[PDB]
Design a protein around this nucleic acid. Structure first.
Lengths: 156, 49, 222
DNA sequence: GTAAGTATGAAACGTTGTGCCTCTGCCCCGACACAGCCTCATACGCCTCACTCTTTACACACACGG
DNA sequence: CCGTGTGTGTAAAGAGTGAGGCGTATGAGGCTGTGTCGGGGCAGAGGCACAACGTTTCATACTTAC
């Protein structure tokens, strides 16, 4: 119940965390955290605004050593990708991880899928799946005024 | 003369002993239950802070 | 003559030995090879009314150690050895004590400073960390212990309700081992549901109030 | 007129007395099977690929010696 | 001078680990139901470590006969 309340409060104040970021702190697994979250939302007769991909951008890119420019680039990529429906029905966290990966690979500071998965708590397979959907549309998602040393025109 | 350092070191050992006592109590509950314990969850960070 | 007997023959011969205090670097160099059978030569020079003791370091070992004697009348010292075959013997009696000092004074401290610094390597100090740690509580769906416990609970499964005859036979068979059993301990031996086990135990067994620990079940119906 | 006890003001340990935890059951549950579709998310597993030092083979070479 | 007596290139096995993608399996969730049983903090016994007068003791002057 305490873990569910903490998750609800974090979601409400506008700095939502992921269930995996509360499980890593609490002594229970994600399943019970989610069950108690739903039970509390049902009992309290309250609701929480749906999480957006931009909410996990700042924390994910601050845990990583990415600069602020790469953070803004990833946020813009993810927002445009969700607007363009390139990732239909996929969790916002996977989309955020894919945007962070592409922004890091295109920028001077490069990060592999493993580190991004550990930071965001997303399996590298999910990162690849969410990255291939937005792979062909890499350039138009980037900010127009974006400096880089590794061309956005070529990426893994 | 007990300056800031030695004064702070006096507090830290009392607060660190509580931290080590707390993890012992937390671990003992899980070990007796038969299940291993998570180290991150055993540590009470508010004790020192 | 026994295992604990001490071979005091050395004392009978009144053999004399010298006790020497030397620094670690001199012994450390000896400990380097420690198997060549030679580390230096001990030179003693005597005059009409004065005696001086000095030691010279081997040239190969290096790649003056003056000795000062001390009075031994204030304390009597003896040297004994324990054989690996459990045969203790007395090597002899100390007749003189000596100490070794360094010929150099200024640059000698430099070697000591290195030793003090070298012994300071295990002295761990707090390290400043440029970036706050963000790996603590890294996101994970299930704790490794939590999945293992869930798998173990699913594997062993719940205890089943065995037939009364089999449960009764096990209870009576175990009664011979000890007069009284605890309900919790008895459950493990019988491996039956607590409610079901209690009903069976109530049907025949009874609980007696004991003033030493607490009221415990007695397997004897009477 | 002391003697054998009579009274009196100190210590001193101990037996109920008082707490002080410490279990002991005991209700009070959730989670097991398992039914379809459903979509996304997580885990496993297995063979194909890589590669890398370390030999492994084999045509050829270059003296060597009697 | 044709025997012999040793080197050398370089990809070819020989292991020796190691890695990566993919495809299958799993899960979680709503739901609804039905037998049953451990569980993780719980309302109620149960017996010991202090604990607090207290009952006896012990000289030490005195009480009471004798």
């Amino acid at each position: 119940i305490a873990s569910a309340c903490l998750y609800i409060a974090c979601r409400q104040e506008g700095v939502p965390r992921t269930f995996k970021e509360i499980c890593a702190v609490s002594r229970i697994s994600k399943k019970e955290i989610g069950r108690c979250f739903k039970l509390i939302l049902k009992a309290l007769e309250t609701s929480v605004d749906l999480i957006t991909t931009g909410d996990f951008m700042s924390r994910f890119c601050s845990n990583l050593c990415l600069p602020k420019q790469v953070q803004m680039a990833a946020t813009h990529i993810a927002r445009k990708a969700v607007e363009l429906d390139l990732v239909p029905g996929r969790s916002p966290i996977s989309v955020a991880a894919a945007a962070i990966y592409m922004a890091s690979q295109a920028s001077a500071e490069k990060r592999t899928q493993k580190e991004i998965g550990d930071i965001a708590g997303v399996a590298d397979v999910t990162i690849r799946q969410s990255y291939r959907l937005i792979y062909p549309r890499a350039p138009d998602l980037f900010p127009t005024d974006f400096k880089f040393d590794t061309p956005v025109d070529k990426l893994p | 003369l007990d300056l800031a350092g030695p004064l702070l070191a006096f507090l830290f050992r009392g607060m660190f002993k509580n931290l080590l006592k707390e993890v012992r109590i937390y671990a003992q509950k899980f070990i007796d239950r038969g299940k291993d314990f998570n180290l991150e969850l055993a540590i009470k960070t508010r004790i020192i802070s | 003559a026994e295992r604990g007997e001490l071979d005091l023959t050395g004392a009978k011969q009144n053999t004399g030995v010298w006790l020497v205090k030397v620094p670690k670097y001199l012994s450390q160099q000896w400990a380097k090879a420690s198997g060549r059978g030679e580390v230096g030569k001990l030179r003693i020079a005597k005059t009409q009314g004065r005696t001086e003791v000095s030691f010279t370091l081997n040239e190969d070992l290096a790649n003056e150690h003056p000795f000062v004697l001390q009075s031994v009348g204030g304390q009597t010292l003896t040297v004994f050895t324990e054989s690996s075959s459990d045969k203790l013997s007395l090597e002899g009696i100390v007749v003189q004590r000596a100490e070794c000092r360094p010929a150099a004074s200024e640059n000698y401290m430099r070697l000591k400073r290195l030793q003090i610094e070298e012994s300071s390597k295990p002295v761990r100090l707090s390290q400043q960390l440029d970036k706050v740690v963000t790996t603590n509580y890294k996101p994970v769906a299930n704790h490794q212990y939590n999945i293992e416990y869930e798998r173990k609970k699913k594997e062993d499964g719940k205890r089943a309700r065995a037939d009364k005859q089999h449960v009764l036979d096990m209870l009576f068979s175990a009664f011979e081992k000890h007069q009284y059993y605890n309900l919790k301990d008895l459950v493990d031996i019988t491996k039956q549901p607590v409610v079901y086990l209690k009903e069976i135990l109530k049907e025949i067994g009874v609980q007696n109030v004991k003033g030493i620990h607490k009221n415990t079940w007695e397997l004897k119906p009477e």
